Amino acid sequence: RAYDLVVIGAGSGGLEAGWNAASLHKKRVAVIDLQKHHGPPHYAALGGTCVNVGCVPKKLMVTGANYMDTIRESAGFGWELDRESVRPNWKALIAAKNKAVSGINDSYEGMFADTEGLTFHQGFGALQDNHTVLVRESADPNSAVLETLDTEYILLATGSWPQHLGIEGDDLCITSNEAFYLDEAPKRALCVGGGYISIEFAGIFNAYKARGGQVDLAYRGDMILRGFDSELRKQLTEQLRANGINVRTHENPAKVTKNADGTRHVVFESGAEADYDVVMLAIGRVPRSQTLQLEKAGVEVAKNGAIKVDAYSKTNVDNIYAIGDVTDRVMLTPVAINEGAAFVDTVFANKPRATDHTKVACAVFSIPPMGVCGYVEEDAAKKYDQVAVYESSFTPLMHNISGSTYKKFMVRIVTNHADGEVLGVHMLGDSSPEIIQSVAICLKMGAKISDFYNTIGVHPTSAEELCSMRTPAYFYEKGKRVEKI
Amino acid sequence: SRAYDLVVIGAGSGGLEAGWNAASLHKKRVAVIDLQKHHGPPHYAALGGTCVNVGCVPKKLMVTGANYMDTIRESAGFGWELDRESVRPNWKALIAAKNKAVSGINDSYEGMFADTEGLTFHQGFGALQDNHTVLVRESADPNSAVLETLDTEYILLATGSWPQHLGIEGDDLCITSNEAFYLDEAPKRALCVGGGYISIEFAGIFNAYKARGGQVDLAYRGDMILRGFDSELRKQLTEQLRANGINVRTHENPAKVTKNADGTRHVVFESGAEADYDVVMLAIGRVPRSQTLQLEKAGVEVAKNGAIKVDAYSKTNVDNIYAIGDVTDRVMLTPVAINEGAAFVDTVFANKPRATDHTKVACAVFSIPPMGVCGYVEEDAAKKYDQVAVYESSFTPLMHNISGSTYKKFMVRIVTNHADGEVLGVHMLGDSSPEIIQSVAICLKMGAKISDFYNTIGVHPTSAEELCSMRTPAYFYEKGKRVEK
Ligand SMILES: Cc1cc2nc3c(=O)[nH]c(=O)nc-3n(C[C@H](O)[C@H](O)[C@H](O)COP(=O)(O)OP(=O)(O)OC[C@H]3O[C@@H](n4cnc5c(N)ncnc54)[C@H](O)[C@@H]3O)c2cc1C
Ligand SMILES: Cc1cc2nc3c(=O)[nH]c(=O)nc-3n(C[C@H](O)[C@H](O)[C@H](O)COP(=O)(O)OP(=O)(O)OC[C@H]3O[C@@H](n4cnc5c(N)ncnc54)[C@H](O)[C@@H]3O)c2cc1C
């Protein structure tokens, strides 16, 4: 066939797989994407969501947002400055972010050029059969077919897309995509959604808002950050509120309308109403398989669009594999990359490999941030008869001094009480995204709580708290909480 | 029988741990002795130890304060506009804040003793009458008033260390870390003598709080500052201190110091160089504080430097006399002294002999930028194994290209035994490295191999993910000889 492989989606996983195949294995690969540079109209582009309108830019923006606290907190450590003079400049933030992302975009032309057998093809990928991939002008299956690629293997890696509401006024809302290109910071912003993207953006808006502004975060549920440790969800909620964010639970917009001055009027399902400069929907990310014509090749997909796969990322059609967000397993970049590498090993190096999706460390770049890995106690309790929960918190000394007395650092460890094995480690507070990476190496090695407490702490750090937790706070006996076992 | 089961001379990190453990957990009658309760002049260290009073605790708070110079500066690239001329350090407020924090810890001991039956605090200078009697005198003077005579079963010598002085003309004109903690004003011109960690840490503190137009020099008689640490990280740290305004003077050593008419110190280096500073701080070493204990009265053996000789179980050549902590000149860190204290109690009073494991102990350098390290540096590893692999990676975070602090390179170096992949040492430089290194220490204790590091999925974006992305050695040492293959 003309190509050994055709990857639809040149993102985290797809670009990793393609380059590995062509580069480390001399296969002829075609990778397809919609654009070569970041931003509208497609947003994601060559490099993926993470490079363009994901992890990379949002982290830069959260870093920029962190200075609001830094300028305030320096006062207790004897830093004098005119604080009344402080004015964040959103345009300058967006400009620096743009220049940094464009630089990564620029980096690819050389990548391809230097890799024989690796080619980039622009347009909308779709399937004609299990060996033929079409590159079309648009998502419409009726649009012009620009290229027809004949290939042995197919790798579907189209990622995900923002989920919308469909209420009246949905078109007056934005999503993370457009948030990355706003002309100016909203004075009043509504972040809809309880997930990490929503919370991360509420923090960014909270810092860059015009003095006197307000950021509201609305979640239809009981508590934000569904899926994360219950106590950290509760504690983070308090710290966001302490910093000015109005966290509104059991809250959902019913309809949005455009005011005369261009602001947005929101009528909530509760009957509550409010005006905002910006209403951002961060309610979920949908597997992007809807226009690939999978049935043309008979590929099985879940009701939500997720492409079904086995441990080695093989769909029901043996020569078609799918990796990354489109598979709706763990939606994080390093996992997509890992899967992309495993697939190449399996298919072109005769080394079958299944990505291990358990004990995957992830971070929540909220202000203040979280670093977590493994099971929350509730999940552990369902899988093990005896589970122990260790918890430790404290307000670092530096925060009493800074005045941010609400900044408690919290560490919670979940173990299988039968053998002491650590099933999950959940942290809240500054530096937790960095600490959790090394904690993940310990969990991968099957550390027991004793491996933690027998290690000599590094002092003074927040991380040494991991090594001083020896007695459980409570337990779960066959799924039920008990104060003792 | 004896009046006391145990008398601890020095109620610091290790001593207070051992005392409290024995009385609380073993119902032993324990007398702990220290020079004072309140931190500061005249004795500096106090009940709580050097770490709480004039060490780790206030040092870290001062380093955090110093970091704001850079962070407030770095905010501009992210769009933070403020009157840059108005930014100025206020040393006295830093000191006051730190004093208040340390005092609050001093005050906590009151309840600690009140709530611990059989645990008593005795204030004064402890000394040996014989192996079963400890005197508490008025001063270090062997001829001062005897306040108390303590008859006891066991004696634990935990008196810590003390700053080493130069003994050159003008030594009396210099200060040490002790006084540095109470300076009335930040020196506009300062000289930090020594290449060890305390000197480097103070250089960064002084560099931030100095009045504009000020200067900090760091003189070290040797080739490269931080003897004992990874050589590449040492080089890199030196350049980053230079890039932040610090003149690092290797092969420099004051020969004479005199007091100028305006009260400033005039230093004449051995080199022939001469200069004036407002403060000259010597941080060249810390000597075992055993000289006024009258150890000869019990026949306790000491080394030429005053270090009390001990076995793995911390026992001196006198069976009922133990010694822990800095006074033993083993690993001069708080957590280690604490560990030794707990092991001591288990051995003597819980009849569960435990020898502290002084290997694979992680530690940090709170310089600006910081370091987090653990295990063997490659030079020592090359000496004990026949095939050593060195892995290295450095990158300059994108955020620093935006902040303007372009010199802020992050570095990770891993030393392994190439024959089996065992990770012998991990050395990191850059922000959060003290936080990251803590869990690295847990896995090295667990016998981690390099594959454990690289099979762990990364957390993105973080600097720590670099630890899990290294799989090819940079070079090797074949039987001590460095080679590329
Ligand atoms: C705001 C935000 C913040 C995030 N923050 C983090 C974080 O901090 N850390 C983290 O690990 N993860 C984070 N993520 C998730 C991370 O971006 C994704 O998990 C990862 O990018 C998914 O990788 P992928 O290979 O599955 O797909 P992607 O990287 O998304 O790549 C898919 C590519 O396919 C292209 N494409 C789609 N359809 C077609 C088609 N029909 N034809 C051709 N090309 C097509 C798209 O243009 C896209 O470039 C974040 C996501 C968002 C949106
Ligand atoms: C500036 C500085 C920064 C440091 N930073 C760090 C760091 O970041 N991390 C780290 O782990 N370590 C650090 N250290 C080292 C740490 O402070 C020590 O390793 C630790 O305190 C040693 O514990 P110890 O029990 O041996 O003695 P100490 O904690 O020093 O306690 C000894 C006590 O004995 C008392 N004493 C002395 N002689 C007598 C006597 N004759 N009678 C009665 N009482 C007496 C003293 O008052 C003192 O309180 C630092 C040290 C300094 C000076």
Short-list A194, A157, A164, A196, CA closest to A178: A164
Cα–Cα distance measured from residue A155 to residue A321, given in angstroms and rounded to the nearest whole number: 5
Residue A307 is classified by DSSP as: B
The half-sphere exposure of A300 on its side-chain side, counting CA atoms within 13 A, is 9
- Determined by X-ray
Are the C-beta atoms of residues B400 and B256 closer than 8 Å to each other? Answer: no
A435 closest CB neighbour out of B56, B81, B436: B436
Cα–Cα distance measured from residue B438 to residue A121, given in angstroms and rounded to the nearest whole number: 46
Burial A115-149 (b: 16+ CB within 10 A, else e): eebbbbbebbbbbeebbbbbbbeeeeeeeeeeeeb
Nearest CA to ligand 1 atom 12: A332
Cα–Cα distance measured from residue B182 to residue B95, given in angstroms and rounded to the nearest whole number: 7
Residue A402 is classified by DSSP as: H
> What is the dotted CATH code of the domain comprising B1-163+285-359?
3.50.50.60
Alpha-carbon dihedral sign for residues B441, B445, B446, B448: positive
Short-list B393, B394, B390, B442, CA closest to B416: B390
Question: Distance of CA A323 to CAs A133, A160, A295, Å?
Answer: 17, 11, 18
To the query of whether residue A459 is one of the catalytic residues in this protein, the response is: yes
Residue listed under structure tokens 């005092």:
B103
State which residue of chain A sits closest to B445, comparing Cα positions.
Answer: A455
Burial B279-304 (b: 16+ CB within 10 A, else e): bbbbbbebbbbbeebbbeebebebee
Q: Is B161 exposed, middle or buried (0-12, 13-18, 19+ CB in 10 A)?
A: buried
Cα–Cα distance measured from residue B455 to residue B467, given in angstroms and rounded to the nearest whole number: 10
Q: Is B194 exposed, middle or buried (0-12, 13-18, 19+ CB in 10 A)?
A: buried
The three-class DSSP label of residue A479 is coil
Q: Is B401 exposed, middle or buried (0-12, 13-18, 19+ CB in 10 A)?
A: middle
Cβ neighbours of B250 (radius 10 Å): 14
Could you tell me the fold of the domain covering B360-485? Enolase-like; domain 1 (3.30.390)
Q: Which atom of ligand 2 is nearest to the CA of B136?
A: 42
Are the C-beta atoms of residues B46 and B12 closer than 8 Å to each other? Answer: no
Largest distance between two CA atoms of chain B: 73
| Distance in Å from the first CA to the final CA of chain A | 63
| CATH 3.20.20.80 is the classification of domain B164-284 | no
Short-list A131, A133, A125, A128, CA closest to A153: A131
Residue type, B73: R
State whether residue A332 sits within 8 Å of chain B by CB. Answer: yes
Cα–Cα distance measured from residue B461 to residue A105, given in angstroms and rounded to the nearest whole number: 17
DSSP notation for A74-115: GGGGTEE--GGG-EE-HHHHHHHHHHHHHHHHHHHHHHHHHS
B52 to chain A, closest Cα gap in Å: 10
Are the C-beta atoms of residues B290 and B307 closer than 8 Å to each other? Answer: yes
> What is the dotted CATH code of the domain comprising A1-162+284-358?
3.50.50.60
Question: Distance of CA A387 to CAs A233, A361, B212, Å?
Answer: 20, 20, 57
The three-class DSSP label of residue A57 is helix
The three-class DSSP label of residue A437 is helix
Short-list A164, A167, A170, A190, CA closest to A247: A190
Are the C-beta atoms of residues A4 and A29 closer than 8 Å to each other? Answer: yes
Cβ neighbours of B192 (radius 10 Å): 32
So where are chain A's domains? 1-162+284-358, 163-283, 359-485
CB contact under 8 A, B439 and A466: yes
Which residues are B429's β-sheet partners? Answer: B371, B411
Question: Distance of CA A175 to CAs A37, A97, A172, A181, A190, Å?
Answer: 19, 18, 10, 11, 11
Cα–Cα distance measured from residue B48 to residue A459, given in angstroms and rounded to the nearest whole number: 15
CB contact under 8 A, A50 and B460: yes
Q: Is A281 exposed, middle or buried (0-12, 13-18, 19+ CB in 10 A)?
A: buried
Q: Which atom of ligand 1 is nearest to the CA of A32?
A: 43
Are the C-beta atoms of residues A191 and A202 closer than 8 Å to each other? Answer: yes
Cβ-based neighbours of A368, under 8 Å, separated by 6 or more: A236, A239, A407, A428, A429, A430, A432
Decide whether A1-162+284-358 matches A163-283 in CATH topology.
yes
Could you tell me the fold of the domain covering A359-485? Enolase-like; domain 1 (3.30.390)
Choose, out of B61, B395, B459, the residue to mutate when testing the contact with A (most A CBs < 10 Å). B459
Cα–Cα distance measured from residue A104 to residue A343, given in angstroms and rounded to the nearest whole number: 25
B119 to chain A, closest Cα gap in Å: 23
Q: SS3 letters for chain B?
A: CCCEEEEEECCCHHHHHHHHHHHHHHCCCEEEEECCCCCECCCECCCCCHHHHHCHHHHHHHHHHHHHHHHHHHCHHHCEECCHHHCEECHHHHHHHHHHHHHHHHHHHHHHHHCCCCEEEEECEEEEEECCEEEEECCCCCCCCEEEEEEEEEEEECCCEEECCCCCECHHHCECHHHHCCCCCCCCEEEEECCCHHHHHHHHHHHHHCCCCCEEEEEECCCCCCCCCCHHHHHHHHHHHHHCCEEEEECCCEEEEEECCCCCEEEEECCCCEEEECEEEECCCEEECCCCCCHHHHCCCECCCCCECCCCCCECCCCCEEECHHHHCCCCCHHHHHHHHHHHHHHHHCCCCCCCCCCCCCEEECCCCCEEEEECCHHHHHHHCCEEEEEEEEECCHHHHHHCCCCCCEEEEEEEECCCCEEEEEEEECCCHHHHHHHHHHHHHCCCEHHHHHHCCCCCCCCHHHHHCCCCCCEEEECCEEECC
Question: Distance of CA B481 to CAs B247, B423, B471, Å?
Answer: 34, 19, 22
> Resolution (in Å) of the shown entry?
1.7
Choose, out of B78, B405, B414, the residue to mutate when testing the contact with A (most A CBs < 10 Å). B78
**Spacing of C-alpha A154 from chain mean position:** 26
Q: Cβ < 6 Å from ligand 2: which residues?
A: A 459; B 9-10, 12-15, 33-35, 43, 45-46, 49-51, 55-56, 59, 125-126, 158-160, 177, 198, 289, 292-293, 325-327, 332-335, 337
My answer on whether omega of the bond before B187 falls inside 30° of 0, hence cis, is no
Helix (H) / strand (E) element for A28: namely none
The second-level CATH assignment, the architecture, of A163-283 is 3-Layer(bba) Sandwich (3.50)
Residue listed under structure tokens 């043996």:
A318
Nearest CA to ligand 2 atom 37: B159
Question: Distance of CA B76 to CAs A89, A96, A450, B396, B403, Å?
Answer: 9, 11, 46, 19, 7
Q: Which atom of ligand 2 is nearest to the CA of B341?
A: 25
Alpha helices (runs of H) in A384-448, residue ranges in sequence order: 397-402, 432-444
Tokens describing residue B455: 């099979």
Cα–Cα distance measured from residue B459 to residue B456, given in angstroms and rounded to the nearest whole number: 9
Cβ-based neighbours of A84, under 8 Å, separated by 6 or more: none
A229 to chain B, closest Cα gap in Å: 18
Helix (H) / strand (E) element for A14: namely helix A12-19
* B 206-235 residues with CB < 8 A to A: 209
Are the C-beta atoms of residues B209 and B183 closer than 8 Å to each other? Answer: no
Residue A45 is classified by DSSP as: B
Best residue among A61, A177, A333 to mutate for probing ligand 1's pocket (most ligand atoms within 8 Å of CB) is A333
Are the C-beta atoms of residues A84 and A22 closer than 8 Å to each other? Answer: no
Cβ neighbours of A464 (radius 10 Å): 20
Are the C-beta atoms of residues A433 and B462 closer than 8 Å to each other? Answer: yes
**CA dihedral in degrees (A420, A423, A429, A431; nearest 10)?**
90
Helix (H) / strand (E) element for A37: namely none
The three-class DSSP label of residue A300 is coil
Are the C-beta atoms of residues B269 and B255 closer than 8 Å to each other? Answer: yes
Alpha helices (runs of H) in A134-270, residue ranges in sequence order: 176-179, 196-208, 230-242
Residue A328 is classified by DSSP as: -
Q: Cβ < 6 Å from ligand 1: which residues?
A: A 8-14, 32-34, 42, 44-45, 48-50, 54-55, 58, 124-125, 157-159, 176, 197, 288, 291-292, 324-326, 331-334, 336; B 460
**CA dihedral in degrees (B205, B207, B209, B210; nearest 10)?**
140
